[PDB]
Scaffold this active site. Structure first.
Site, mmCIF file in Angstrom:
data_model
loop_
_atom_site.group_PDB
_atom_site.id
_atom_site.type_symbol
_atom_site.label_atom_id
_atom_site.label_comp_id
_atom_site.label_asym_id
_atom_site.label_seq_id
_atom_site.Cartn_x
_atom_site.Cartn_y
_atom_site.Cartn_z
ATOM 1 N N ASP A 1 0.763 -1.220 0.000
ATOM 2 C CA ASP A 1 0.000 0.000 0.000
ATOM 3 C C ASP A 1 0.808 1.292 0.000
ATOM 4 O O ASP A 1 0.221 2.291 0.450
ATOM 5 C CB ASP A 1 -0.926 0.022 1.232
ATOM 6 C CG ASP A 1 -0.174 -0.050 2.558
ATOM 7 O OD1 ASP A 1 0.862 -0.744 2.660
ATOM 8 O OD2 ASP A 1 -0.552 0.555 3.573
ATOM 9 N N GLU B 1 3.053 2.225 15.264
ATOM 10 C CA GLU B 1 4.478 1.967 15.063
ATOM 11 C C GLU B 1 5.402 2.794 15.969
ATOM 12 O O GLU B 1 5.551 4.045 15.880
ATOM 13 C CB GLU B 1 4.917 2.152 13.586
ATOM 14 C CG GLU B 1 6.410 1.785 13.415
ATOM 15 C CD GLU B 1 6.853 1.829 11.957
ATOM 16 O OE1 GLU B 1 6.133 2.127 10.983
ATOM 17 O OE2 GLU B 1 8.033 1.559 11.707
ATOM 18 N N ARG C 1 8.513 -3.699 2.390
ATOM 19 C CA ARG C 1 9.857 -3.824 1.900
ATOM 20 C C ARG C 1 10.523 -5.170 2.122
ATOM 21 O O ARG C 1 11.214 -5.638 1.219
ATOM 22 C CB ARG C 1 10.805 -2.730 2.453
ATOM 23 C CG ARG C 1 10.933 -1.630 1.414
ATOM 24 C CD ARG C 1 12.123 -0.718 1.532
ATOM 25 N NE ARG C 1 13.233 -0.988 0.623
ATOM 26 C CZ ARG C 1 14.370 -0.292 0.591
ATOM 27 N NH1 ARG C 1 14.564 0.731 1.416
ATOM 28 N NH2 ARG C 1 15.319 -0.630 -0.275
ATOM 29 N N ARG D 1 11.021 3.964 -4.641
ATOM 30 C CA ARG D 1 11.454 2.592 -4.931
ATOM 31 C C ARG D 1 11.630 2.446 -6.427
ATOM 32 O O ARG D 1 12.692 1.979 -6.874
ATOM 33 C CB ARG D 1 10.511 1.638 -4.177
ATOM 34 C CG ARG D 1 11.187 1.329 -2.831
ATOM 35 C CD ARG D 1 10.253 0.936 -1.728
ATOM 36 N NE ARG D 1 9.910 2.038 -0.824
ATOM 37 C CZ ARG D 1 8.874 2.074 0.016
ATOM 38 N NH1 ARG D 1 8.013 1.065 0.143
ATOM 39 N NH2 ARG D 1 8.687 3.150 0.770
ATOM 40 N N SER E 1 3.238 -8.655 8.420
ATOM 41 C CA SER E 1 2.487 -7.818 7.453
ATOM 42 C C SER E 1 3.527 -6.921 6.774
ATOM 43 O O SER E 1 3.868 -5.958 7.448
ATOM 44 C CB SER E 1 1.481 -6.962 8.236
ATOM 45 O OG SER E 1 0.959 -6.013 7.308
ATOM 46 N N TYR F 1 11.549 11.977 5.348
ATOM 47 C CA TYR F 1 12.328 10.944 4.703
ATOM 48 C C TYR F 1 11.659 9.574 4.884
ATOM 49 O O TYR F 1 11.738 9.018 5.999
ATOM 50 C CB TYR F 1 13.777 10.848 5.183
ATOM 51 C CG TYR F 1 14.797 10.983 4.074
ATOM 52 C CD1 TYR F 1 14.839 10.071 3.025
ATOM 53 C CD2 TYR F 1 15.713 12.026 4.079
ATOM 54 C CE1 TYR F 1 15.771 10.197 2.013
ATOM 55 C CE2 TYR F 1 16.647 12.158 3.070
ATOM 56 C CZ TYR F 1 16.672 11.241 2.040
ATOM 57 O OH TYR F 1 17.603 11.371 1.033
ATOM 58 N N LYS G 1 -0.688 -4.440 14.410
ATOM 59 C CA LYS G 1 0.553 -4.412 13.664
ATOM 60 C C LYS G 1 1.543 -3.515 14.378
ATOM 61 O O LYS G 1 1.711 -2.294 14.178
ATOM 62 C CB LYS G 1 0.321 -4.018 12.199
ATOM 63 C CG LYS G 1 1.572 -3.719 11.351
ATOM 64 C CD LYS G 1 1.148 -3.570 9.870
ATOM 65 C CE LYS G 1 2.403 -3.287 8.989
ATOM 66 N NZ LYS G 1 1.984 -3.467 7.545
ATOM 67 N N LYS H 1 -6.231 -0.453 7.158
ATOM 68 C CA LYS H 1 -4.953 -0.193 7.748
ATOM 69 C C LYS H 1 -4.728 1.324 7.929
ATOM 70 O O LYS H 1 -5.121 2.098 7.041
ATOM 71 C CB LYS H 1 -3.901 -0.825 6.854
ATOM 72 C CG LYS H 1 -2.444 -0.898 7.401
ATOM 73 C CD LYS H 1 -1.882 0.344 6.656
ATOM 74 C CE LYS H 1 -0.449 0.534 6.954
ATOM 75 N NZ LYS H 1 0.144 1.566 6.079
ATOM 76 N N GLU I 1 -2.223 0.030 13.881
ATOM 77 C CA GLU I 1 -0.779 0.056 13.794
ATOM 78 C C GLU I 1 -0.127 1.212 14.521
ATOM 79 O O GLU I 1 -0.004 2.338 14.015
ATOM 80 C CB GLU I 1 -0.361 0.093 12.288
ATOM 81 C CG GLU I 1 1.132 0.142 12.047
ATOM 82 C CD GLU I 1 1.616 0.169 10.608
ATOM 83 O OE1 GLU I 1 0.891 0.273 9.621
ATOM 84 O OE2 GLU I 1 2.816 0.096 10.355
ATOM 85 N N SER J 1 8.116 -4.714 9.379
ATOM 86 C CA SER J 1 9.532 -5.090 9.358
ATOM 87 C C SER J 1 10.475 -3.991 9.791
ATOM 88 O O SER J 1 11.630 -4.300 10.169
ATOM 89 C CB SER J 1 10.046 -5.583 8.002
ATOM 90 O OG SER J 1 9.708 -4.809 6.883
ATOM 91 N N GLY J 2 10.093 -2.739 9.464
ATOM 92 C CA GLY J 2 10.811 -1.635 10.111
ATOM 93 C C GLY J 2 12.175 -1.337 9.525
ATOM 94 O O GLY J 2 13.031 -0.729 10.174
ATOM 95 N N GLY J 3 12.467 -1.759 8.294
ATOM 96 C CA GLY J 3 13.795 -1.546 7.733
ATOM 97 C C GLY J 3 14.832 -2.627 8.098
ATOM 98 O O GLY J 3 15.936 -2.540 7.524
#
EC number: 4.1.2.13
Lengths: 363, 363, 363, 363
Positions: free
Chosen positions: B33, B189, B303, B42, B300, B363, B229, B146, B187, B271-273
């Site tokens: 998404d 985060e 990247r 990307r 979920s 960023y 999440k 989400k 979520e 995943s968070g990088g």
């Protein structure tokens, strides 16, 4: 906790100055911010079509009344459409308002939405992209804003969720206005609907306003840069007990002294479906109440300044002057009532005694 | 307090069924998404133009991978644009997803906005007209949504205001989704940025998740109909101490056991990088942790499922099949890792070891 | 927020071990902690004088029952007086309890007091000098404590104030116990009084327990080192609708799954004026409920383990053995019911069917 | 929410009258409520034994000063022991105080206790059996009480837990006093310790007082029947920047206007280890501050009224009159300073310039 200051000294000084100018002694607010759907019902009553031009003409009739109104009105709340309209002489309405001494304000909420798992309670929406709209409005002439939240008295209402959520959303809107140089009018309206007595309204108003000022503190809101627009404390519409104006005044001023810090610059009451005269008589008792009232106590009236005007107007362009006079009567009266100098004593034509009450579910 | 039930029995049964189907054993979520602005970065990396068609082709490459992926993916989160696109064979993507066993989801937040008077903290916007968008999306094929909130660890962050406000806004979005038959993925985060150690991340995660589940309770949210999440508990990006995968797993599973009720249907990690492999290795330790884990513990991933695919693709249409294989490798691996059956042991091509970390201010 | 760790690793390990030992599989709790005033009423019923010696003899009869009881009772809650008494053979009761496999616990609250401005709601007192009493009790043999808070279901009860205040005071007592090596049993009792149906009890229990676990999180309480003692979810005493045991079980286990984190070590139900048998039958349905129950689900019973014993005893020293048998019957039954292996099927003598309900205002 | 009125009209009238009498214009409070342990240190300084008789004689010296003090002192806070002592002429001290125009008050807290999981923060204990002690004290002559809570400014202090918990416990003590006809003085002290500047003290004071007034509202406390005893806003003891008296005054009065409702009857400052003179000079600037100050702004001083007296006394019975004069000097000065009529201008003997600062951990 720990400071990262929301505002600079100069931003604070600007906010406090606008707030103070709006509610300078003798002055109150015209609420002229009915959306298209709500001004349609008022134009229907006088058998007039809800077109853009009639909405423009009717707003021009309020905003170009003669100069008896200049010391009476510190601020005028407009609906987005009107903020971009012009009077017949070519000037944009914001310019019309400012040349007569007034501060221009804009309604920025997007209405109420249902809270699930409640007995019909609402919160109010409108935060999305609020920052960007406030910065445009500020460039377009507005210095203050208005956002209305609605609570209801009932067997299990207001709930803790409704109180909490409505307080939190007023605090968010306030923060975002202050960042963009706009004075937020915080309006936690407790509806008059229902058969509760004066003392239930007073207890509920105390509990709501305490949650509001805690929320504003948690969101770092500069209180000198705000105004409050609450309901007076009255019994419910269907209450059979009768209360006097001094009981309404005492209840109101005792509920406000217990909750609203002295830093708040002023308090601009809504009328709530009181008639023109009743709304003036209560304001004047509030301002005669013997207790220490450390903030301005004035009017931010919609229907209680417009009813006789609308009815005199009738949609006829030749009644213009009769309609303006009828608004100027009411403006003079509330300018005296916010000083506790209003004399009911027949006088004037004597604006409507008809109730302006509408019942506020779907309606 | 007092009940006015948010949902009926049948609405509850519908929500619990969708939630349970998404995180059935062996299954996780593809997060596809990325808005236009974020997928542009990307596509830049592989020297490919950010047009609508390339965005369509790249999403088609993920969504039409062969049937090794069907038992691996219970759900796919789409961006609004993609929900209305079609594959080359004429079928709308929601139809493509459902025919392979998947549930379609839609990102409904409108991004983060600054909280004034804070050290750069945000809340997230998107509630306005959310009810109406959810009812359209539900008609258009989506069954889950989400909404991402972002907190930061710092000397005085997260603040009580940031925690409170972000919890409250997740609860509002959740309520509105459930009313319209959509399962909300909540979520909250907590970013990896900064040099804090594993134990600071774990303490902050415990405090945030406790505020979240209290907020959801105050807003009457049906927990069986939700998914969470969260971030795994890891040390900060710039932390110099090194922690093992079992320490990351223990910390994570101990933070979740202390805060998340057993009624929540599942937990779908971001995943968070972390790189593709690291993200699989942590999921698999989490699911090997000896403590009682009463909810599904799956992925979920955005990247961490796409990196090798994107790089194999390169914007060349003739690498299609090489790119799909690279995604299917990663899907198989996370389907094993959510069962605690993943074997790192060289294997596969062996998806990226390159960090996917970007630093999350401007960023 | 920010950590200054309440407890060390070794203090945590000690707390988790005591908590886990108390509610090991097959085991529950004897609540024998009636103060002097409350055991007086039970001794009156059997025409026996309320002297110290009769209180000592009656407690000795429970605590020296034969060894069929050893695997059944993980813990025994005593009243301060009894903690310092001795059996006839010279051993101090704490020693009697420990030699049979049990953990000794002590009631440390000082009763309920009225909350002003409420409809008869209470909070509970006892924090003063609690730290010092806990450190003495720990030296004197006790490893766990008990503090009871009382909420009531009514038209406007429980109030937000009662919920908040009772949650906060349980969290304070818990913190202070953990500091002194004692496992706190948190007991937020919702009374059975009134005519509400099963679903009102369930909704109120969910709201109370959510406030409790948020409070415990705000006070930094180590959850693995605690036990909960809640009411089962039942309809009110005067409710005319009839509910089955599986409805009581489902409601109870669904209310607990929504609120109690999986880290809590166990849940030790109170009986609430259910008869001996009914209290066993509900425990056994709770433990047969098909949902995932990630904590022990056992008994911490006062009257539901003692009624047939008291009546068999009759204050006569020659009925000692008949009275013990009657307690051992009930202990066996609840040891099976906490495993979901209890067979009502006539059996045993078959302990009281008489209700143990007393109405809990002044009474 | 919903009303079950905490107090009757007559109970309210009684509370408002006592509160108003204490802080009538020109009047302040003598805090003479040092426990035995704390008056021991002051008697040590003048090489005098801490016996009961010396404590009695020293309190008699303050309480029987001549009648220049009668219009200066509206209230005197005593320690439990002194409330039951008699002057040399046979009259009980409460009688001595009342015959000179004063209201008798009693310290009812039992000191501070540590909050686990914090950086040395405290709450305060004393609620147990508070109701019963208040009803006895009221019979024994006291009409107001005092309960002190202590917060500290530091890198991560005060915490949200410390703020919340201390606010809640002040509200509980207040409720219980009002029920028994006693006016509670709420004292949320923020210590001066540390090197923070004026603006950190001001921000922390605003946040604490907002939590306090929300707590008092949640507990239904009648605000007209209370007094507040806060710290002035000053920089920290070790702060190297220097602030003037008008900056201290502005900061203080701006922090109070933002948080304390106009219904609170008055505000009685603590001195905080300011010298006698400095404490008078700050009170007088506070009361000259040009902003609207809708409550009394007076003194409730312990060390800042007693230092020169204690030192003149020296434990010698023949210095009695020199010691009384020294207290009467200070009483006159603070009676002028609470009216903004105090003239520093050498004058009097001119009470101590010596700091009375002690550092408030263990000490």
């Amino acid at each position: 906790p720990y400071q990262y200051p929301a505002l600079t000294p100069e931003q604070k000084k600007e906010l406090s100055d606008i707030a103070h100018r709006i509610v300078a002694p003798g002055k109150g607010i015209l609420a002229a911010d009915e959306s298209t759907g709500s001004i349609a019902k008022r134009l229907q009553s006088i058998g007039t079509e809800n077109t853009e031009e009639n909405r423009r003409f009717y707003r021009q009739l309020l905003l170009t009344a003669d100069d008896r109104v200049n010391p009476c009105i510190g601020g005028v709340i407009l609906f987005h459409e009107t903020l971009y309209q012009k009077a017949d002489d070519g000037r944009p309405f914001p310019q019309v308002i400012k040349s007569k001494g007034g501060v221009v304000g804009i309604k920025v909420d997007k209405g109420v939405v249902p809270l699930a798992g409640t007995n019909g309670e609402t919160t109010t929406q409108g935060l999305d992209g609020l920052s960007e709209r406030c910065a445009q409005y500020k460039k377009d002439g507005a210095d203050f804003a208005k956002w209305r939240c609605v609570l209801k008295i009932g067997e299990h209402t207001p709930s803790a969720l409704a109180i909490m959520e409505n307080a939190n959303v007023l605090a968010r809107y306030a923060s975002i206005c202050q960042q963009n140089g706009i004075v937020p009018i915080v309006e936690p309206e407790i509806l008059p609907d229902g058969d509760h007595d004066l003392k239930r309204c007073q207890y509920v108003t105390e509990k709501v306003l305490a949650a509001v000022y805690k929320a504003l503190s948690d969101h770092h809101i500069y209180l000198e840069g705000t105004l409050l627009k609450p309901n007076m404390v009255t019994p419910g519409h269907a209450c059979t007990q009768k209360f006097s104006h001094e009981e309404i005044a005492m209840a109101t001023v005792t509920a406000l002294r217990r909750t609203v810090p002295p830093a708040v610059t002023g308090i601009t009451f809504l009328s709530g479906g009181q008639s023109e005269e009743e709304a003036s008589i209560n304001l004047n008792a509030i301002n005669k109440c013997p207790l220490l009232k450390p903030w301005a106590l004035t009017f931010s009236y919609g229907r209680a300044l417009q009813a006789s005007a609308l009815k005199a107007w009738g949609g006829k362009k030749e009644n213009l002057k009769a309609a303006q006079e009828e608004y100027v009567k009411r403006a003079l009266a509330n300018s005296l009532a916010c000083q506790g100098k209003y004399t009911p004593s027949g006088q004037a034509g004597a604006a409507a005694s008809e109730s302006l009450f509408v019942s506020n579910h779907a309606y």
